[PDB]
């Protein structure tokens, strides 16, 4: 299972927001994706962590790290901006033994 | 990598017995190493409905096809692309109809009463509504689903017979906006 905390964040434009994803298992060969919710609740892919590495899809202040307890995460919104408020989740996914996908809750950030 | 998946159409609409292809692509730019796949989200296992078009694979499209879509088929998947150490997906939906097309019509004199009851029956998905054109007195009518899920609608209308009069039954439709109708001469 996957938590993503807190569940609302308001802020005012130009915070450095964070949500943590906290994974009920940790597994090196884990990855794990922060998506945002469309209109019509598609996931829209914002980063990924993969290798020990922070990826970032098409803008570079969203940030993953990778705390010491190895299954929390902070997801980093750096320089917050209005069209960053929206609805996110964290997502992961293992390949052995077999296929598992998992899913957080949603979170809605809400930039000032 | 920079790996994501698009979905250039999120709802599907399928008659009952026909295919869908449910389509994702993805970006070729970020071919050995790529796995695709769809799952049904009811838990989400891997589907077993459908196949892979692999072909379509290197034009960057993960193309995935179910013949004779059913009323279970309906609801959402998710298509996953992993490629190396990345990997994105989408979610998809499919909606089913299936036209009240077939309309079973019967007239029967009700004994003592001296009035006709009228019956019109069809099958078809979502749930229809039925009314009865330019008729006063209300029709009762009733629904049960059939084994492969559609439903099996019946309306039955009781009345003292008017001269020269047939009577039509009306099956409206409303998620597909489809009125299908059937003429009954007593």
């Given at each position: ?10 802020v005012?434009?130009?915070?450095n ?16 994706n ?6 019509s ?7 990924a962590?993969?290798?020990g ?9 969203f940030?993953?790290?990778?705390l010491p307890?190895?299954?929390?995460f902070?997801?980093?919104?750096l320089?917050?901006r209005?069209?960053?408020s929206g ?10 033994p ?15 | ?5 698009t ?8 008659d009952?017995?026909?295919?869908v ?12 190493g ?18 892979l078009?692999?072909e ?10 179910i ?8 609801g ?5 692309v ?11 939906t499919?909606?089913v109809?299936?036209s009240?097309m077939?309309?079973?019509?019967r007239?029967?004199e009700?004994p003592g009463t ?11 998905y979502?749930?229809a509504?039925?009314?009865w ?8 009518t ?11 609608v ?6 003292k017979?008017?001269?020269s009069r ?20 007593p």
């Amino acid at each position: 299972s996957l938590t993503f905390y807190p569940a609302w964040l308001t802020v005012s434009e130009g915070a450095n927001a964070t949500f943590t994803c906290s994974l009920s298992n940790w597994s090196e060969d884990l990855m794990l994706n922060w998506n945002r919710l469309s209109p019509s609740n598609q996931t829209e892919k914002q980063a990924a962590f993969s290798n020990g590495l922070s990826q970032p899809v098409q803008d570079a202040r969203f940030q993953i790290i990778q705390l010491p307890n190895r299954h929390d995460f902070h997801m980093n919104i750096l320089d917050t901006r209005r069209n960053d408020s929206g609805i996110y989740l964290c997502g992961a996914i293992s390949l052995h033994p077999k296929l598992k996908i998992e899913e957080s809750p949603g979170a809605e950030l809400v930039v000032t | 990598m920079l790996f994501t998946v698009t979905a250039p159409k999120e709802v599907y609409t399928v008659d009952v017995g026909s295919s869908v292809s449910l389509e994702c692509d993805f970006d070729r730019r970020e071919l050995e190493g790529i796995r695709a796949s769809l799952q049904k989200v009811e838990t989400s296992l891997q589907s077993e409905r459908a196949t892979l078009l692999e072909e379509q694979l290197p034009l960057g499209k993960a193309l995935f096809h179910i013949p004779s879509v059913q009323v279970r088929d309906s609801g959402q998947y998710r298509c996953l692309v992993i490629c190396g150490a990345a990997w994105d997906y989408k979610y998809l939906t499919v909606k089913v109809k299936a036209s009240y097309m077939r309309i079973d019509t019967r007239i029967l004199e009700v004994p003592g009463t001296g009035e006709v009851q009228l019956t019109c029956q069809a099958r078809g998905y979502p749930l229809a509504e039925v009314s009865w054109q330019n008729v006063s007195v209300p029709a009762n009518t009733s629904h049960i689903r059939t084994p492969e899920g559609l439903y099996q609608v019946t309306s039955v209308l009781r009345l003292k017979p008017q001269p020269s009069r047939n009577f039509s039954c009306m099956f409206w439709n409303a998620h597909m906006k489809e009125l299908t109708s059937a003429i009954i001469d007593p």
